[PDB]
Enzyme design. Sequence first.
Site, PDB file in Angstrom:
ATOM      1  CB  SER A   1      26.844  83.379   1.153  1.00  0.00           C
ATOM      2  OG  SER A   1      27.182  83.705  -0.196  1.00  0.00           O
TER       3      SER A   1
ATOM      4  CG  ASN B   1      35.482  77.075  -7.626  1.00  0.00           C
ATOM      5  OD1 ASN B   1      35.418  78.227  -8.037  1.00  0.00           O
ATOM      6  ND2 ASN B   1      36.577  76.350  -7.715  1.00  0.00           N
TER       7      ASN B   1
ATOM      8  CB  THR C   1      -9.903  48.059   0.960  1.00  0.00           C
ATOM      9  OG1 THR C   1     -10.726  47.315   1.882  1.00  0.00           O
ATOM     10  CG2 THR C   1      -8.960  47.106   0.209  1.00  0.00           C
ATOM     11  CG  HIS C   2     -11.177  50.966  -2.278  1.00  0.00           C
ATOM     12  ND1 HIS C   2     -11.292  51.245  -3.628  1.00  0.00           N
ATOM     13  CD2 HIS C   2     -10.510  49.799  -2.193  1.00  0.00           C
ATOM     14  CE1 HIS C   2     -10.718  50.278  -4.325  1.00  0.00           C
ATOM     15  NE2 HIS C   2     -10.236  49.387  -3.471  1.00  0.00           N
TER      16      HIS C   2
ATOM     17  CB  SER D   1     -10.607  70.757  22.191  1.00  0.00           C
ATOM     18  OG  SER D   1     -11.982  70.538  21.896  1.00  0.00           O
TER      19      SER D   1
ATOM     20  CE  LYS E   1     -12.874  70.724  17.714  1.00  0.00           C
ATOM     21  NZ  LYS E   1     -12.935  72.169  17.296  1.00  0.00           N
TER      22      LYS E   1
ATOM     23  CG  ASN F   1      -8.397  70.332  16.968  1.00  0.00           C
ATOM     24  OD1 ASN F   1      -7.419  70.850  16.447  1.00  0.00           O
ATOM     25  ND2 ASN F   1      -9.519  70.125  16.302  1.00  0.00           N
TER      26      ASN F   1
ATOM     27  CD  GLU G   1      -4.680  69.102  11.407  1.00  0.00           C
ATOM     28  OE1 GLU G   1      -4.612  69.874  12.388  1.00  0.00           O
ATOM     29  OE2 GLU G   1      -5.643  69.071  10.599  1.00  0.00           O
TER      30      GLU G   1
ATOM     31  CE1 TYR H   1      30.194  77.097  -7.633  1.00  0.00           C
ATOM     32  CE2 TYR H   1      31.464  78.957  -8.502  1.00  0.00           C
ATOM     33  CZ  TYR H   1      30.624  78.415  -7.520  1.00  0.00           C
ATOM     34  OH  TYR H   1      30.290  79.118  -6.364  1.00  0.00           O
TER      35      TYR H   1
ATOM     36  CD  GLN I   1      27.249  80.731  -4.064  1.00  0.00           C
ATOM     37  OE1 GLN I   1      27.925  79.700  -3.974  1.00  0.00           O
ATOM     38  NE2 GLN I   1      27.423  81.770  -3.253  1.00  0.00           N
TER      39      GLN I   1
ATOM     40  CE  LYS J   1      26.985  77.663  -0.509  1.00  0.00           C
ATOM     41  NZ  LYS J   1      25.927  78.316  -1.366  1.00  0.00           N
TER      42      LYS J   1
END
Lengths: 434, 434, 434, 434
Positions: B8, B86, B131-132, B253, B259, B261, B266, B293, B298, B301
Amino acid sequence: IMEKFNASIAYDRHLWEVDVQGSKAYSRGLEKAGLLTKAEMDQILHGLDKVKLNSNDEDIHTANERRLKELIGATAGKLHTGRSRNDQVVTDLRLWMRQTCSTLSGLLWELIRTMVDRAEAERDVLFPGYTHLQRAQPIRWSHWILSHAVALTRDSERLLEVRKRINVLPLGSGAIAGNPLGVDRELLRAELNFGAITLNSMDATSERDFVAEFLFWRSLCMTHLSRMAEDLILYCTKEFSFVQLSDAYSTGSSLMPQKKNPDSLELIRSKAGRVFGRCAGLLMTLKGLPSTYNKDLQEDKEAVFEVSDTMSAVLQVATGVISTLQIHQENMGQALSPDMLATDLAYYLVRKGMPFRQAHEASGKAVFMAETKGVALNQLSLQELQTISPLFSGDVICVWDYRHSVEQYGALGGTARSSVDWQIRQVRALLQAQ
Amino acid sequence: IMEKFNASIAYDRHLWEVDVQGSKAYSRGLEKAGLLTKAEMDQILHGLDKVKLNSNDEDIHTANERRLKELIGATAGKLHTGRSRNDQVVTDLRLWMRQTCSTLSGLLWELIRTMVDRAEAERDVLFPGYTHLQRAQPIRWSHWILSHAVALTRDSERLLEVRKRINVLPLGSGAIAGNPLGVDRELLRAELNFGAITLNSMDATSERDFVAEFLFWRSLCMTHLSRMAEDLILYCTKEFSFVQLSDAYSTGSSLMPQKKNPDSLELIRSKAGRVFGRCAGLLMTLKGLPSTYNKDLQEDKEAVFEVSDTMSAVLQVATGVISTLQIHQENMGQALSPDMLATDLAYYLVRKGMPFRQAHEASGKAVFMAETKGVALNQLSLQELQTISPLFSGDVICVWDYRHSVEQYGALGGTARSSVDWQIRQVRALLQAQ
Amino acid sequence: IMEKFNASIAYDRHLWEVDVQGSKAYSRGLEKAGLLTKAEMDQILHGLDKVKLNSNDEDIHTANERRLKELIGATAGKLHTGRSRNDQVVTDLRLWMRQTCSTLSGLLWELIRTMVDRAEAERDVLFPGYTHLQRAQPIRWSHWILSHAVALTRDSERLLEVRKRINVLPLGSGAIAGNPLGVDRELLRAELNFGAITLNSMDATSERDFVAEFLFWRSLCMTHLSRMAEDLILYCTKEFSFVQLSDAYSTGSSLMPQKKNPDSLELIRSKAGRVFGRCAGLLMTLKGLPSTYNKDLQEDKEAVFEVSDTMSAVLQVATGVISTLQIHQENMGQALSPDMLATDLAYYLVRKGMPFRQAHEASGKAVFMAETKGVALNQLSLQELQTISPLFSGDVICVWDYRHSVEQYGALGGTARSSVDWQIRQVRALLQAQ
Amino acid sequence: IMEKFNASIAYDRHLWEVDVQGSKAYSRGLEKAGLLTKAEMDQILHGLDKVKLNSNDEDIHTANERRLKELIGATAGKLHTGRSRNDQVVTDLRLWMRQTCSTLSGLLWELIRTMVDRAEAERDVLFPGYTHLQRAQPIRWSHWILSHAVALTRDSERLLEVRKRINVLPLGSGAIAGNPLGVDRELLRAELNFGAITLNSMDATSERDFVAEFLFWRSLCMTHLSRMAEDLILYCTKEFSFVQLSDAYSTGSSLMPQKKNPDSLELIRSKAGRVFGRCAGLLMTLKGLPSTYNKDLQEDKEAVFEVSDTMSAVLQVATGVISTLQIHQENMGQALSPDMLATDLAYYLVRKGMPFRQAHEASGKAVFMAETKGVALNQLSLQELQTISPLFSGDVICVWDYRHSVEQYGALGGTARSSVDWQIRQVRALLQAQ
């Protein structure tokens, strides 16, 4: 196929008694603005308590006005000025859900009520506690019943928290920007009996966090109930035979009736992902929708309609299995073993003033001794234990009592009768402030 | 591979400053029970503030005691009596998370603070509402900035609600049943500065709802921020050119610098499912785990460790894009059109005492008139509009003002300057009670 | 944080031996077009077999050219004309994956090889077959071992089918449209040893179906192995005690060594959703990305890197548990019961010319008789069975043989020794054509 | 509620014409074993082609035999010996699906057929290619149409691969072990017209990989179609105005008809996760089910029933949008810009014998020159370019031709007319071997 794709009536039939009530208020709203006269306001108001089908309609909102418009006709056309489908519908949904969660919170409450009450009743039964599915420690039956209460108790804290986030009023948010005719939102929040109005027109319209949270919740409550059922169908094993199912909540077993075949505790487990499925979808359906109210969002309905009908129903079968539940006590008490008590000899010398590694090495020496003596821990001689450690004395006898080992786990939250009694209070009380 | 599967340490390095602090308390617990002497209690206490690696260790819990055991040696062995891995670990995790959510709630708070403050500042800018994805109504820029505030505001209500469910103390729940040596949980809840102790030993051990809720949350906050980024990268289109990105929060760019960019907006959108991914997993990982348990768990984490490091970081880039954000105002104001104002002629006659279907048929007749006249709505003659409806008079002039149409959406929650000002209060205040 | 967000080196270190090889070919491509001279072509070619770090680099592609550019310097700048990051990287990934699936298909093949071979070996062991987790029919041990073979066998058919969809060559697809300098794709598909070139520049660049299918696969193979482990940890129960784990593939149990504690068969089960998690994400990450190569897609790497390292490793532990696996035969043979044989008396009279409902009513009458006689099915008298049906005769004796009942299930695919032998052929053969 | 939970008829009505056909064969099977006489075999055979409802029935399997049993009565009871629900139903489902995928593969084939054919037709149109949603390179319209073909083409390779994995015959696998009465599986695979019989009784019964693969597929095809719709609703923006929707596949826009409002290309995008949802569930529903046929598995039906009805229908609307699709050519051709041509001056000197960094620095010097000259790239003087590089000559004129730049991307897979023609062959051909 497209319009028969645009068609919402098949699934959205349920919003009737919600579509009429949401209107009667907005009727009272427009007149207060002076958009309707009392005389005509009282015209479309009655119709919406005076209110077959038709093929040309798309949604339940249609079905109503299309009906409203005959009996009233005149006033009818105006009834729906300023409030478009997009704000009409979220009102039509916050409303249904908020009634359905009141219901949902009650069913779940009985389940916790039914378990806690039983725990009190069966308090003294012993059975084993497993770790990686292997006999580890003697622990009480109510201590099992109680861990599914406490955990189900959290779900109602959640569902009570969502109950309030649903109680928001969006009506009057028009289409993108607000209501143009000015009708006050306040009156709309008083009549519809909601907590308060929403502080933005573009969010009330495009957002469905209210259903998203509800599906997060459901998927979590099932994760909880699919575990309760994993435990039970395992305790229901001919091999284990801890609990025996009710032959009403159990499936037909013939020619070998010894096979008391589960099912209810299997249907409860399947739903785990059928509930999670919709949540896993509803969140992807809106992964990055550009702006205010896209058509994409028509998914809000079918989904909370399926997940809520699965939940309100499953919770009843879950209470229905816990209460009928018949346990084979002897089998459970015979399911214990001194091998689990070995770790308890370490805790004895610890109280007699000895360090652990040492104390637990003496236990280890006590294991090896019975091993080679062949005769197990209960079969060990006093002077023998006086050989492993002189600290060992007459009181070693009581260490071979499974219920003594259980009443050894105190300090709030343990499995001593004292602690189980304390838990049975805390949950019940937690529920009392709910 | 197995042990290098059991290992771990690689991911769980972070729990150091949490493993020592959780012990120092449990050290103070055992002595209060009389399991440690002040003199020796003060021995392992200092070590755990006196405290390289080693290959034979599995977890961070090991790494410490294995170190503690040299410098102290004696007392060290006993330090860890009654509290197993535990219960040790969930304490080691509730603790980290509860510090990391304090952090998480602050970052998210600045994002809402940064947007609301800016909204006030750019209040008067106009741009269109879609809207759309199609030009529908003139609406304010702060009215956009504000719908991402209100929605992000909910996330901090959630994260504040989880902040309290994490603040529970499990320490002292032993392995299956409680603490055998009796050490009081109360002292353990005071020292560790947690809200209260947990009312069950089997739930505190087997349950990870605290991380499950956190991942539900994160996946929802990203659904929110992946939408903010879908809007922005679209507004950042050379075609649209509403907002221009900071050349610090924007990608290189060349040869065609026109452009400008995007990238930051993103990376924010990609995470939507990378965050949802872990939640979609953590819930399946425990679809129906039998008892107290299992090792399965495990997974708690690595998951909250990735989702939290993605969240605390993304929220900073999100605030970092909203504040730098430079807008091309002219472009946005030239992005309006009287075609959107057509629906506003319907709302005029409505105030002059006319019914909607009729009122909106006159608008329809006004459209067709300009169509065939060839010269658009602004180019329409007064007596002409007096032909469509005598109700039309000198005040038709003001209907061709985009900002008039926007100040037409009042009644709390609309896009009138008045309403935006009201919202800028409500969010800020909401935050004030947080 | 952003650039330290753009930074790809931490996880994408692995593409080294793939980045140099993909170049050496594209080096051979450009010269064939006449873009490089043999003399200079042979300059950057050696460097890329002549080829520390640096902070200013983002990706592994950088790290190389940034290195290539010293030793060579001149030619180096041109090396990378026409082939941008977006087409360079998918080549850098199809390549790694296609080598890693060769690996993946071999590991999985040994697992199926290891099980089928063992099945042959333990063929004659009997144990019970469960339905809703309850003793139903005596069935062979290899018949269990074999159902996890056949099912794992499908996974390698899948993984072999993906192996070919990955083997496509995208190199030369430029950025949006193809290669401007004309370099032939054909040479690039021969050198890189791929199946064929891709028939579109915008798909090769924006599409990651190759990783999406791989994660669909993995998540399905684990669904398969998390079931194998659910079966095994249950068969490993002290209560059941069918199989005993290897104390190398089993966790430390002390003071009560009777508790042979599983773990390997728990780590295998946890991954089910940790593998599914990434798939559940990678598909949402690209829920509706507008056009050719968005930055969103940087998720393709970390994901197939984690899911493949989890898979190649888990499959080895799975083979590692099946082969070591030690079974407690007596326990398994004593796990049978004539109650399961009751349904077999119905199949006897059926062969003696009797109808089923009737035949199975006689069995029912035989059950009730032993019930009330108190002495079970084996204890039933011949004339007694001649009372229930005269068709019953001396051959009823053999119906009380568990292995007779098992050799009663023939007709290809049953659990008769004959059929198990037939299956052990079919899988092995299936693998032979793989 | 439980039985009305066990109830399968509401959703499983569809298996009628599959339940009768699967029986008529198994009827022919038992007689071949000599379990039925021709005379009685021909009795229940006709009934199952001679074959209202009833409340006491659970499933469609019931509904039939319960009906079969009146008209025939006698023979009827025996008809169903040896073949239980669990093997009866998977036969009842492999069968429906295998017919429904034949259908599914045809619809999807027309979509690819419809796009490829159109591509040929509109081949010469130019429009821009975007990267991070910003104008980068002039590329052909068919080159866009084609990247959604190639990608949809893969889906039918997949669906054709699943078509064969579904075509397996499980019938005769009894309940856990095979058929006891010996009836040959071979006859059952010939009559039912399936590819082959299954080589294991426990897998055919407990496994639903056939539906799991189908949902993996669907969720991937939608990921593909939800992108096609993300592109289209964006190209359909009043801001972009590349394509105009059919006013049959488009939503009502009034008072401002300039707002040609999408919907079909929104319903297609929503399903992405509604389809993925079920897959995300069906895999969790069976995360680790212990043994042979658990009741959990009743989820196989509702799920493939919803995902297939969504898919067969959506694909038709998708073909229905691509074929009607009307494009605004001028708008698209005016959507280009010499700024995108800047990178093309670098490719000119490259052919005139110049190195790239240098070549692209000259382009950079050409940009800066027009910038400061104020008059753009088309406005640049010949001797001027002879200043930046003497290599520049009369042929710079053609570099300002958008279609020249497009016919610059050759070498199989590029966007030159030559390459698009090559692609239009390859897909069509790929389909020809399908």
